[PDB]
CSV table of C-alpha atoms and ligand atoms in Angstrom, one decimal:
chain,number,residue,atom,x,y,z
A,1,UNK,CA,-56.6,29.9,45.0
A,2,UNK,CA,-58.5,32.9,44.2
A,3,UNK,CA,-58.0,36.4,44.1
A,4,UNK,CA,-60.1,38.8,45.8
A,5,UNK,CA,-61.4,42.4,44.4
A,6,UNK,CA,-62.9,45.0,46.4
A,7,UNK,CA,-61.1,48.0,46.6
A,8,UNK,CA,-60.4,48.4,50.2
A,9,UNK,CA,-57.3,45.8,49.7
A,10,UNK,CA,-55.8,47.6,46.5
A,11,UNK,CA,-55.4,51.0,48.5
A,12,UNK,CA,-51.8,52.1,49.0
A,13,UNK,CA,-49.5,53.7,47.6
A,14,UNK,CA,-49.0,54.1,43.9
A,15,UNK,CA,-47.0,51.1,42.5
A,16,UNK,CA,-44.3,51.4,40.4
A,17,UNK,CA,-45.5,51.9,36.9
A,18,UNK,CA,-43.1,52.4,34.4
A,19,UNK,CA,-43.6,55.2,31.9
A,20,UNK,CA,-44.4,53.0,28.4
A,21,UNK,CA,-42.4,53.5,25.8
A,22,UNK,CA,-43.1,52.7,22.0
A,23,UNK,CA,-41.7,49.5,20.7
A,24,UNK,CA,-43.2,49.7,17.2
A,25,UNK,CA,-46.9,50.0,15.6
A,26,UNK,CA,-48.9,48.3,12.7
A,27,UNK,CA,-51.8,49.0,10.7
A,28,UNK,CA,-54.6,46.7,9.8
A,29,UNK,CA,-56.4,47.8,6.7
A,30,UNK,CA,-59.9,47.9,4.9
A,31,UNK,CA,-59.9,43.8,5.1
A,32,UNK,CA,-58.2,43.5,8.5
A,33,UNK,CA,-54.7,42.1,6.8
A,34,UNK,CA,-51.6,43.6,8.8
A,35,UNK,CA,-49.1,45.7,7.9
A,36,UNK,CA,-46.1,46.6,9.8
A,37,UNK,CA,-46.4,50.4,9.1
A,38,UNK,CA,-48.3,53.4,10.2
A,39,UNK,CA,-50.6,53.9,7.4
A,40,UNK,CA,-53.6,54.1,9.4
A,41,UNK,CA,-52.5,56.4,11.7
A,42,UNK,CA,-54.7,59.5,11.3
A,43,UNK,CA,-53.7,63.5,12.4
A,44,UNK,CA,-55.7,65.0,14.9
A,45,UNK,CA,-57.7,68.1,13.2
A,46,UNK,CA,-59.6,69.8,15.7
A,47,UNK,CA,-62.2,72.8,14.8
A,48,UNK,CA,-60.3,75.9,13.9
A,49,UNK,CA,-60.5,79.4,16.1
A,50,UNK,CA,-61.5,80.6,12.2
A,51,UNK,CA,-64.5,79.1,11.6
A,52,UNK,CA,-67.2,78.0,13.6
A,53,UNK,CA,-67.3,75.4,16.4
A,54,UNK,CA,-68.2,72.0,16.2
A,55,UNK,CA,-71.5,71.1,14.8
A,56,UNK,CA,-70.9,67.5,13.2
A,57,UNK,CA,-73.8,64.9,12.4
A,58,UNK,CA,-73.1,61.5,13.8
A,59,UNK,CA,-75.6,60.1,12.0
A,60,UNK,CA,-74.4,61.2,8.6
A,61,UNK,CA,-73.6,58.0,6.8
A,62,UNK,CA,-75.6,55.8,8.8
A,63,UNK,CA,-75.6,52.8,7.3
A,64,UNK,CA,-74.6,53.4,3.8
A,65,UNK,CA,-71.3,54.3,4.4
A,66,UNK,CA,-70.4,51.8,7.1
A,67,UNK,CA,-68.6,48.8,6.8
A,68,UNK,CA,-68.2,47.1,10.1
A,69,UNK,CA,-65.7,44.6,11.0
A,70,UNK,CA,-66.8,41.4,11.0
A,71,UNK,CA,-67.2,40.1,15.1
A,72,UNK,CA,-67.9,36.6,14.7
A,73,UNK,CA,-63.8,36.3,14.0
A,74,UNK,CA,-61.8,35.4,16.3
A,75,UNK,CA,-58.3,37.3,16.5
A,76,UNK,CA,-57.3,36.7,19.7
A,77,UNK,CA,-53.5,37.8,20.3
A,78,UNK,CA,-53.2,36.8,16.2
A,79,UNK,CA,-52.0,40.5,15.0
A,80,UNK,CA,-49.4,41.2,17.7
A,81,UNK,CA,-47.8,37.7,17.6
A,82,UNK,CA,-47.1,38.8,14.0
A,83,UNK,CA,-45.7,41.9,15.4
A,84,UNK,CA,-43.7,39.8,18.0
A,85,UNK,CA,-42.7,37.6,15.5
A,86,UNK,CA,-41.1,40.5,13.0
A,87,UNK,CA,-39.6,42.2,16.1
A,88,UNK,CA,-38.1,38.7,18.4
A,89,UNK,CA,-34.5,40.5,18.5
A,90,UNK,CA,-35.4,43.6,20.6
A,91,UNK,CA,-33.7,37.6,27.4
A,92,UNK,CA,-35.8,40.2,28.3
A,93,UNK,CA,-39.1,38.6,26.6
A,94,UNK,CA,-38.9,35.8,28.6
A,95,UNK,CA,-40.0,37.5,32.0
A,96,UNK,CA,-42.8,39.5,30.2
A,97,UNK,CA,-46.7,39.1,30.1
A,98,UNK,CA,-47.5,39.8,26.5
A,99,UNK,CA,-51.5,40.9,25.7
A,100,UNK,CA,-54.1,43.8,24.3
A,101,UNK,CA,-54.0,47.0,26.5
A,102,UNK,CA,-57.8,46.3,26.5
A,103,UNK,CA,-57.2,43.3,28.3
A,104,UNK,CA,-55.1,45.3,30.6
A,105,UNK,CA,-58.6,48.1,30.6
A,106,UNK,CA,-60.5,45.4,32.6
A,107,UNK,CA,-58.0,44.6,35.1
A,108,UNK,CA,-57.9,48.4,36.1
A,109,UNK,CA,-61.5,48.5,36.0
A,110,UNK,CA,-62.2,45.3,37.9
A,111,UNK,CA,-62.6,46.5,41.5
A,112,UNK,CA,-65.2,49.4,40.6
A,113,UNK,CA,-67.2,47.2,37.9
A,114,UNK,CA,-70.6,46.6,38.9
A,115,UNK,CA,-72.0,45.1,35.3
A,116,UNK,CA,-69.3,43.9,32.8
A,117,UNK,CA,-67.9,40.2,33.9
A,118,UNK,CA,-64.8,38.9,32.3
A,119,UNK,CA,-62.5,36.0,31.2
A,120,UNK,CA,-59.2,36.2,30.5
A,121,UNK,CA,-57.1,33.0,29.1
A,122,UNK,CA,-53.8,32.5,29.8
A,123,UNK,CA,-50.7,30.3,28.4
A,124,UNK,CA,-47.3,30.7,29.4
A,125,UNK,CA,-44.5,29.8,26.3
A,126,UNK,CA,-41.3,30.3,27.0
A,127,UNK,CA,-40.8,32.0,30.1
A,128,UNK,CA,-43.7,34.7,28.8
A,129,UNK,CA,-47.3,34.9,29.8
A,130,UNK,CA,-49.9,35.9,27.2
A,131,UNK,CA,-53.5,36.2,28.4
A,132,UNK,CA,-55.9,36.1,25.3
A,133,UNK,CA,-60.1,37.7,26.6
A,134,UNK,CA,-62.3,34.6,25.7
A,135,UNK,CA,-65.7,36.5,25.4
A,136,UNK,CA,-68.3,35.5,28.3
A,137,UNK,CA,-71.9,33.0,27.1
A,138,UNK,CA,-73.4,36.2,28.2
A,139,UNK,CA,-71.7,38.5,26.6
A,140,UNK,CA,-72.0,36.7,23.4
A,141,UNK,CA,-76.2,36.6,23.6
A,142,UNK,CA,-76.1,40.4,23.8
A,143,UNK,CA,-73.7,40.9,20.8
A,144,UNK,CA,-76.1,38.9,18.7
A,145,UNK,CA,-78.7,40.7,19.6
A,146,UNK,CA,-77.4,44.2,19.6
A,147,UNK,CA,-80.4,46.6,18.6
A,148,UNK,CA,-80.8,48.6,15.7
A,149,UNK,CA,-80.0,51.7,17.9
A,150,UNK,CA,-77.4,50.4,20.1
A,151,UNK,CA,-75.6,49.1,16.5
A,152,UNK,CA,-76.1,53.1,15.7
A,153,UNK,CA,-74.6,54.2,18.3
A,154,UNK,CA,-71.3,52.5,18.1
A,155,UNK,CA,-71.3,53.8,14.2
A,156,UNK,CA,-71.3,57.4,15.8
A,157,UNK,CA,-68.2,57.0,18.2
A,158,UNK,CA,-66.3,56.0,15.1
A,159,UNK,CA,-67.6,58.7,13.0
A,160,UNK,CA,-67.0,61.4,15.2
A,161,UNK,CA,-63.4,60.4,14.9
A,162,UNK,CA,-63.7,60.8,11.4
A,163,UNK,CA,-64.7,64.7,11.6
A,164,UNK,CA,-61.6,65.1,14.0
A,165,UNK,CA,-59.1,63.9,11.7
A,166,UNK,CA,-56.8,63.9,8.7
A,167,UNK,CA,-55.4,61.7,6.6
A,168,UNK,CA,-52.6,63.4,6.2
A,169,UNK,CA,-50.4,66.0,9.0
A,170,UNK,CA,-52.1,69.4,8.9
A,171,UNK,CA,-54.8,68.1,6.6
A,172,UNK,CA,-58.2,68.6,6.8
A,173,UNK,CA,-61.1,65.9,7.7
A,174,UNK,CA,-63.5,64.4,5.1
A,175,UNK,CA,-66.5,63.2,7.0
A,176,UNK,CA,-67.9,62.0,3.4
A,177,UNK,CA,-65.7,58.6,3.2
A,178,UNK,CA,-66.3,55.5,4.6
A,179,UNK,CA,-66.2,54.4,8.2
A,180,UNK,CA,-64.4,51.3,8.0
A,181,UNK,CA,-64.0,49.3,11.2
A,182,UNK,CA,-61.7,46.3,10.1
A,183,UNK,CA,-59.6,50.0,9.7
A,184,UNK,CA,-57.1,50.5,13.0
A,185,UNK,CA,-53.7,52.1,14.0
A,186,UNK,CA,-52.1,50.1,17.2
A,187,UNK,CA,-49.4,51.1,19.0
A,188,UNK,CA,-46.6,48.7,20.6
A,189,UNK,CA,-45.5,49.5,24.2
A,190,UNK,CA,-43.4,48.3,26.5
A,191,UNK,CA,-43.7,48.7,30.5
A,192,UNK,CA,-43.5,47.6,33.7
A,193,UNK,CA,-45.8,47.3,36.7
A,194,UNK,CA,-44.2,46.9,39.7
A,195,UNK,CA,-41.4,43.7,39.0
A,196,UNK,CA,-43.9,42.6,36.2
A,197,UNK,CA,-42.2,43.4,32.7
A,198,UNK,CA,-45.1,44.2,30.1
A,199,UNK,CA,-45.6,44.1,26.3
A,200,UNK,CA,-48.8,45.0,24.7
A,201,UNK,CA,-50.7,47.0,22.2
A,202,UNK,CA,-53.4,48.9,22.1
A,203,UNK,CA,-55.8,51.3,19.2
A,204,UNK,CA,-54.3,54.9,19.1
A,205,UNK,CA,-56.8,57.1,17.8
A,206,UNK,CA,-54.6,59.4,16.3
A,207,UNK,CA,-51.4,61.8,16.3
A,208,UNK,CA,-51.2,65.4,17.1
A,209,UNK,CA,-48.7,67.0,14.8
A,210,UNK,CA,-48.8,70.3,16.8
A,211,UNK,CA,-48.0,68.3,20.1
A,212,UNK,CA,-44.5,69.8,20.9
A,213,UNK,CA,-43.2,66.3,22.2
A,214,UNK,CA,-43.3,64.9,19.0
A,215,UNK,CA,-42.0,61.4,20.1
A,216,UNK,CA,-45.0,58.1,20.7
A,217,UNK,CA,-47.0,57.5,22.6
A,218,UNK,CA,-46.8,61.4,24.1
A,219,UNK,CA,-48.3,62.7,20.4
A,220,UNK,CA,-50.8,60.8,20.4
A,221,UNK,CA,-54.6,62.0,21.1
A,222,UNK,CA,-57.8,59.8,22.0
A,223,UNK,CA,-60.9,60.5,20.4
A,224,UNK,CA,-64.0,59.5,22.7
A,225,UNK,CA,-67.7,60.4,22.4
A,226,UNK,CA,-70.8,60.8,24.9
A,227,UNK,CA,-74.4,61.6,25.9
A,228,UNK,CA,-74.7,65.7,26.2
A,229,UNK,CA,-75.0,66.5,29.9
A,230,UNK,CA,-76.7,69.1,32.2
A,231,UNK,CA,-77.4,68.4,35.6
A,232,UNK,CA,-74.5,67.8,38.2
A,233,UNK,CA,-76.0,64.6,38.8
A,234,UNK,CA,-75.2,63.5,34.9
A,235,UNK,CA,-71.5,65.0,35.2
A,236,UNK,CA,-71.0,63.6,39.1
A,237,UNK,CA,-72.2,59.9,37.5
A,238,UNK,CA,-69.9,60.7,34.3
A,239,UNK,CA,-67.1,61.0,36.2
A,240,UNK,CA,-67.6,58.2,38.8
A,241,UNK,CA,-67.5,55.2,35.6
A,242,UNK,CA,-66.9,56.4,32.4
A,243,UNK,CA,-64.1,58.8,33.2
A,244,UNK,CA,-62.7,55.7,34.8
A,245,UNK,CA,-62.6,53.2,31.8
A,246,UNK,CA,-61.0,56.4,29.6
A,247,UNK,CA,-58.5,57.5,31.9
A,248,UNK,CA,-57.7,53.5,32.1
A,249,UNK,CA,-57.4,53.4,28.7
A,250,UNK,CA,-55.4,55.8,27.6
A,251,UNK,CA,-53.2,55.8,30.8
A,252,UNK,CA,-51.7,52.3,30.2
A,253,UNK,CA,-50.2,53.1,26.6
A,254,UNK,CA,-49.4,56.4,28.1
A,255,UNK,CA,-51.9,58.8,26.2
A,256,UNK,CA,-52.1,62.4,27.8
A,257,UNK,CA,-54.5,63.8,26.1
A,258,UNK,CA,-58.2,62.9,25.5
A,259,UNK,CA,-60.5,65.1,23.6
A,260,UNK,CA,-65.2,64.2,24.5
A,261,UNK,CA,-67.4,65.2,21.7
A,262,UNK,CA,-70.8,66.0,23.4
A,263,UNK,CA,-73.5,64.7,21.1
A,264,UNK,CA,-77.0,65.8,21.3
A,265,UNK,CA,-80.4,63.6,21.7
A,266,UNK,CA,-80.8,64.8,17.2
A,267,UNK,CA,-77.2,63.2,17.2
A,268,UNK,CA,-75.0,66.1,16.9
A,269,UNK,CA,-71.8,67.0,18.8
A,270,UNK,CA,-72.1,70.8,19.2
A,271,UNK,CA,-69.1,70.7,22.1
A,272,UNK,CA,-65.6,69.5,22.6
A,273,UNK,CA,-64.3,68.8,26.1
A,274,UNK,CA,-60.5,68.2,26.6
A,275,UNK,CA,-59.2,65.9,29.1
A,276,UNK,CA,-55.9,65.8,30.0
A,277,UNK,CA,-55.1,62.0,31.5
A,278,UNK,CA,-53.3,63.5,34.1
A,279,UNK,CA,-56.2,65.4,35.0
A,280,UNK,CA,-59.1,62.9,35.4
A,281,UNK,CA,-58.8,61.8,39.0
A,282,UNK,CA,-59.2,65.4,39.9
A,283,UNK,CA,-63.0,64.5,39.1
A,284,UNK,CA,-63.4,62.2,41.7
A,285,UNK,CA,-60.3,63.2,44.3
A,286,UNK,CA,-62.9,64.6,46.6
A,287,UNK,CA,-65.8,62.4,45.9
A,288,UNK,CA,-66.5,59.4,48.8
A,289,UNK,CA,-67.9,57.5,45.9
A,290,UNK,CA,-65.1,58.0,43.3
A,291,UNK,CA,-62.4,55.5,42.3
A,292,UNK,CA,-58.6,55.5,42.5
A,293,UNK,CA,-56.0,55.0,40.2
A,294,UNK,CA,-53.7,53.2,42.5
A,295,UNK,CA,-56.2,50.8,43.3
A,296,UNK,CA,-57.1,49.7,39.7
A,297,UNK,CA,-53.0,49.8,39.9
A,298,UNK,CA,-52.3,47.5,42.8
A,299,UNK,CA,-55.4,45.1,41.7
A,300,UNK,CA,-53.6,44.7,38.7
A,301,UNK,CA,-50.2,43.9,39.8
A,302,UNK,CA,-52.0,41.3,42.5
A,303,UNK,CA,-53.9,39.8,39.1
A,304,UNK,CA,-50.8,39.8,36.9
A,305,UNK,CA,-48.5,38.2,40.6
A,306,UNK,CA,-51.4,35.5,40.9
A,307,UNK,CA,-51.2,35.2,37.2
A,308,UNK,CA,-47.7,34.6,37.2
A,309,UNK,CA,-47.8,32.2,39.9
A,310,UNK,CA,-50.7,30.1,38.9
A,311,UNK,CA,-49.6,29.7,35.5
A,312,UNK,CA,-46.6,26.9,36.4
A,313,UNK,CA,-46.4,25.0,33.6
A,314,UNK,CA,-44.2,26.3,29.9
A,315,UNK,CA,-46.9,24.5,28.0
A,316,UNK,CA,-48.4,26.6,24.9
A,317,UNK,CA,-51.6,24.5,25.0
A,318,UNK,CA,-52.5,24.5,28.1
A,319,UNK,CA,-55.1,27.3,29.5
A,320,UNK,CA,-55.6,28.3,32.8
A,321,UNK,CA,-59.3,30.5,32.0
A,322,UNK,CA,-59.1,33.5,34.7
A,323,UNK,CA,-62.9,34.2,35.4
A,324,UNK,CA,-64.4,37.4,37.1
A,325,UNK,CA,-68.0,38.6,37.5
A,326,UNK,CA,-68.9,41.4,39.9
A,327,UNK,CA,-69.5,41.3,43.5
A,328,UNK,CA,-67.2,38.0,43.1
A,329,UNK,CA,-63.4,36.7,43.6
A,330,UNK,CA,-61.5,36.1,40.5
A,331,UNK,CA,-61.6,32.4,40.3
A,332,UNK,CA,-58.9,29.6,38.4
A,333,UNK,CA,-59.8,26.4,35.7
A,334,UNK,CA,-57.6,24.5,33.8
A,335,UNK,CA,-58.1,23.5,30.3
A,336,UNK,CA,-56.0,21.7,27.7
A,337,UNK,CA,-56.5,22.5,23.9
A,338,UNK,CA,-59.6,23.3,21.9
A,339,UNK,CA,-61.4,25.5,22.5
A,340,UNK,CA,-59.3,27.5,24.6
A,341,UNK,CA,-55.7,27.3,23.4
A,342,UNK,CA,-55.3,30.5,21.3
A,343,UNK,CA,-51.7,30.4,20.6
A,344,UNK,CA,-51.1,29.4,17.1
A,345,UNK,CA,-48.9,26.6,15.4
A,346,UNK,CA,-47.5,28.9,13.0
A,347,UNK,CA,-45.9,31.1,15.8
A,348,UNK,CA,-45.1,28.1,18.2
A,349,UNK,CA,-42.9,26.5,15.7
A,350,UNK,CA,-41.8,29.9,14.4
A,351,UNK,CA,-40.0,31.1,18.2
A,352,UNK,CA,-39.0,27.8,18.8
A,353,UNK,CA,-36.8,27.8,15.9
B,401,GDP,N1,-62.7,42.0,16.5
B,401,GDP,C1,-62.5,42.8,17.6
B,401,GDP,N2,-61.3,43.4,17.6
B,401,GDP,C2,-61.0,44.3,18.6
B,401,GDP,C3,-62.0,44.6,19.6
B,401,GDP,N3,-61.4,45.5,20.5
B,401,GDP,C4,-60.2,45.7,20.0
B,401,GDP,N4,-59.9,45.0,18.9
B,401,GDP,C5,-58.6,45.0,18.1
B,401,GDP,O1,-57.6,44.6,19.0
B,401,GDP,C6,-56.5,45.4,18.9
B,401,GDP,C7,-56.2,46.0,20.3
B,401,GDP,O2,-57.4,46.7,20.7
B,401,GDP,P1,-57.4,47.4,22.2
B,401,GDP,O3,-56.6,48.6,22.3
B,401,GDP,O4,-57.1,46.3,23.2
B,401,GDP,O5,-59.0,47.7,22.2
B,401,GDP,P2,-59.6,48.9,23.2
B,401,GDP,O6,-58.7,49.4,24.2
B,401,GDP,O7,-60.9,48.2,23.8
B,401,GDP,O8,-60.0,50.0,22.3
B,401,GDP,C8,-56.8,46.5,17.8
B,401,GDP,O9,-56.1,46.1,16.6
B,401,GDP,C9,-58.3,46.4,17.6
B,401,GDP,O10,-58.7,46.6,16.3
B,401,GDP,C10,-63.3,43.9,19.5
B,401,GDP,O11,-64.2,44.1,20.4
B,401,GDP,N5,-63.4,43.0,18.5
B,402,MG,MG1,-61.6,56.0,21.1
């Protein structure tokens, strides 16, 4: 059929969500090739007590030093099938849905989105379900014609992570290098929602070698940047949607700690703000307009059960495209090969043997 998405039918009480654990990591590098090592992973290096607070120039760098990765490619579920591939003797695969924890991002967010549609493909091989994002018609016009300033502006979320961190633990940042976004650290995670086993992966900003639990993904800190507010109206309307898409994101891999760099309409963060994952809902606990994390919880255990149940066939080319736009059901097609099939030959043949 089709599955329904307003939030009145997701509240209830928290499901079971098992707390993820780390199954592994791998680094892509300054030409996007994988390595099955932390290399990229970068130590979180806040402002000192010492010196003075935070007074860092997004725009420094802007566009000499910044190579972007290249968005035409398609990468699909390429990176961690390589991970799966180096890792198939860790049957409990069998029963798991396998994808990004982005992909994951937009199922939470689903019942309070009002703008972002989505697509999600899906292919079940041997016993496991991997959904694969195929990027909407219309979300493909805007990225081609992003605007000078809105291309900018995506330059200075990555480059405020650059004045936060170190290359090396208890090192100090160098906000003169490149910003390199073919450059990533992902994290492997294993979980559970409800009876639905997961496996996924997701872009850890960095590591915090002063967090006393020193084990993944606890250690771990996500960097995030924003517009500079004042009125109550700005922070009440903060809370209300963007809150929600970080505490989604870093709640999945099981990030607890978020740090917001401020910045300023001349393009400079002059304040940090910690958020504590844990903490975020205590935003929007009072608010009659707020959202829920048990709802973006139960939707997404009713999308990964209709998932599960629609997907019949063990049939690696075979696609059934999960479509979603807002004020709307999430609706079913089928489709057999190109352009849809995103699992690849090379790892087909490879778990089959
Ligand atoms: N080309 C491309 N790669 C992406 C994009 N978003 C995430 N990735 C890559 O996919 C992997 C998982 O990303 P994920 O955690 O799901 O993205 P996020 O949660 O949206 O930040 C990482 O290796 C990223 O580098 C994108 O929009 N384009
Ligand atoms: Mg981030």
């Amino acid at each position: 059929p089709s599955l329904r998405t307003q939030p009145s039918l997701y509240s209830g009480p928290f499901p079971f969500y098992r707390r993820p654990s780390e199954l592994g990591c791998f680094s892509l590098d300054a030409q996007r090739q994988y390595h099955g090592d932390a290399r990229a992973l970068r130590y979180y290096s806040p402002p000192p007590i010492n010196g003075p607070g935070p007074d860092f120039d997004l725009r420094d760098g802007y566009p000499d030093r910044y190579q972007p990765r290249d968005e035409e490619v398609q990468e699909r579920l390429d990176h961690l099938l390589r991970w799966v591939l180096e890792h198939r003797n860790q049957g409990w695969l069998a029963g798991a849905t396998v994808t990004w924890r982005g992909h994951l991002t937009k199922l939470l967010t689903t019942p309070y989105e009002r703008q972002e549609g989505w697509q999600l493909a899906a292919s079940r091989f041997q016993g496991t379900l991997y959904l694969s994002e195929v990027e909407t018609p219309a979300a493909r016009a805007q990225r081609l014609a992003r605007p000078p300033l809105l291309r900018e502006l995506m330059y200075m979320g990555y480059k405020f992570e650059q004045y936060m961190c170190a290359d090396k633990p208890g090192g100090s940042p160098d906000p003169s290098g490149e910003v390199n976004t073919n450059v990533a650290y992902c994290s492997v995670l294993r979980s559970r929602l409800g009876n639905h086993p997961l496996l996924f992966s997701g872009e850890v900003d960095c590591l915090n070698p002063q967090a006393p639990c020193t084990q993944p993904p606890s250690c771990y800190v996500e960097l995030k940047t924003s517009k500079e507010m004042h009125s109550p109206g700005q922070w009440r309307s903060f809370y209300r949607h963007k809150l929600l898409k970080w505490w989604a994101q870093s709640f999945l891999p099981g990030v607890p700690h978020v740090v917001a760099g401020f910045r300023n309409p001349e393009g400079f963060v002059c304040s940090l703000k910690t958020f504590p994952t844990m903490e975020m809902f205590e935003n929007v606990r009072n608010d009659r307009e707020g959202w829920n994390p048990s709802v973006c919880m139960n939707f997404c255990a009713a999308f990964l059960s209709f998932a599960q149940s629609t997907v019949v066939q063990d049939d690696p080319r075979l696609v059934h495209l999960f479509s979603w736009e807002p004020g709307g059901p999430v609706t079913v097609s089928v489709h057999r090969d190109a352009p849809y099939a995103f699992l690849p030959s090379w790892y087909v043949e490879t778990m089959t043997q």
